[PDB]
Amino acid sequence: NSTAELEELLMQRSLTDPQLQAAAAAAADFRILPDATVIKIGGQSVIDRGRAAVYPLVDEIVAARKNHKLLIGTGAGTRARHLYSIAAGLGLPAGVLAQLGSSVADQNAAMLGQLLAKHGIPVVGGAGLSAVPLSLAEVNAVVFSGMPPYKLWMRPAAEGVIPPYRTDAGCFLLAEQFGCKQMIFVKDEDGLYTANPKTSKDATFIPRISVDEMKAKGLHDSILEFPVLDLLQSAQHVREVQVVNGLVPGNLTRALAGEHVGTIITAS
């Protein structure tokens, strides 16, 4: 291979041409924000719970940004589910629901960001880079809304009109495309179990699992949006994620320090 040979294919072939696809795969790999960690703060699992859940996490974010560059995305939660229910009952398609869900994630970003504003941490747009480089260099953290910007172009699921790519996917894709070193989902359970811990008595905790093993156990749609698991298997930069309980004081701090709290889900 060579740059000339890749450029030749790029000019002469369809982008669908497997030979072109293979030459592009040999391109160098630049990480835009390699020292940053993406964190998702759950909507239903954290922010919807109010002060008791959010205030300790604000304290951890403030302590953590002294030693860690953080991109903090927000989930949507119960107001998005209400909107999805209204719109789905009207027959509206996934692309319309996607925009509704994004405004709820935006609301949660604004609430979290206002609690962090006196520490210098801004709310920034989620579609891309925006004020991220400057803020990460100065105050070491930004807050963004976790919904992907697909709007009416959202890919529908195989069944139903609920957008399949929501705030887990949004936060994951930004970690992946910025080449961040780490992706932490902050939810309301210690991690993955063999069954839903809220509706199962005897679920067993799983410290570490691959995507393939998850699928072989029926856990494809459990604590993470199942589409995120497939995105993870295709990822170039973020080949594992960590799921932790944001309701446990210090859990985020300890996860950022490299402690294996929660569940590590690996692409392979």
């Binding site: 369809s14 697909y150 495309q177």
Partner: protein, 245 residues
């Protein structure tokens, strides 16, 4: 049951970026044909990217940039093609409209005027999917997602070739390239080798809710777009696997 059709009377037409790349020789006859179609149909005309996106891919890949960086860089070229095409139709009341406007205000714009132009790329931006170093959700894919989300009456893809062949009809195996008058998306997805349409188009066809057929026609032959918008078979028909209610 399936979601309602938002704009059931809409016709969506995707113009290939490589058609635009041919300049006035291709664009002037297409603009004249579009002008004649304005009183017949309510048109959303969406432009692809073409060769300039290949250049920015070449530079971006040489710089090591990830696929989420290359996606908006390519989308910009589809937007430029849309501004060019709209400028040629301005005297007919046609303008380019931005993605947020297409997403939320298309109904009022098509009430004001007979056609609008927009970018066929979807706004995946840095949230493009990983896997390939080439952005997968491109102009065909965005145009179909929009047409099917709207529940439009059709989507017609305007190409620089007659349709889909069994091989690239401008490529090294051109000699064994056989024209395919009709195909299914599932059959195409099983084939390996190049296509004139995004591979991701076949994926979004599998989850489609309204559009049953998409025709790929040669925009370099005057009259094929007009015939295709009346349902006449003049290129390759792609069956999406949607079936009627």
């Amino acid at each position: 049951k399936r979601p309602i059709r938002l704009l059931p009377w809409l016709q969506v037409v995707k113009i290939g970026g490589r058609v635009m790349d041919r300049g006035a020789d291709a664009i002037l006859p297409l603009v004249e044909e579009l002008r004649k179609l304005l009183p017949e149909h309510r048109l959303l005309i969406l432009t692809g990217a073409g060769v300039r996106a290949r250049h920015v891919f070449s530079v971006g890949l040489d710089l090591g940039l990830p696929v989420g960086s290359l996606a908006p860089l390519a989308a910009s070229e589809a937007g430029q093609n849309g501004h060019i095409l709209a400028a040629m139709l301005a005297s007919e009341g046609v303008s380019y409209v931005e993605h947020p406007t297409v997403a939320d205000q298309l109904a009022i714009h098509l009430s004001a005027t007979r056609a609008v132009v927009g970018s066929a790329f979807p706004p995946y931006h840095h949230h493009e999917f990983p896997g390939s170093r080439i952005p997968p959700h491109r102009a065909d894919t965005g145009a179909f997602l929009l047409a099917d989300a709207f529940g439009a009456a059709g989507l017609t893809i305007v190409e620089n070739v007659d349709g889909i062949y069994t091989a690239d009809p401008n490529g090294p195996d051109r000699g064994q390239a056989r024209f395919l008058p009709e195909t299914s998306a599932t059959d195409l997805a099983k084939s390996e080798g190049p296509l004139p349409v995004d591979r991701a188009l076949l994926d979004v066809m599998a989850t489609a809710r309204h559009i049953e057929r998409v025709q790929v026609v040669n925009g370099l032959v005057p009259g094929r777009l007009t015939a295709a918008l009346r349902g006449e078979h003049v290129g390759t028909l792609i069956r999406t696997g949607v079936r009627p209610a």
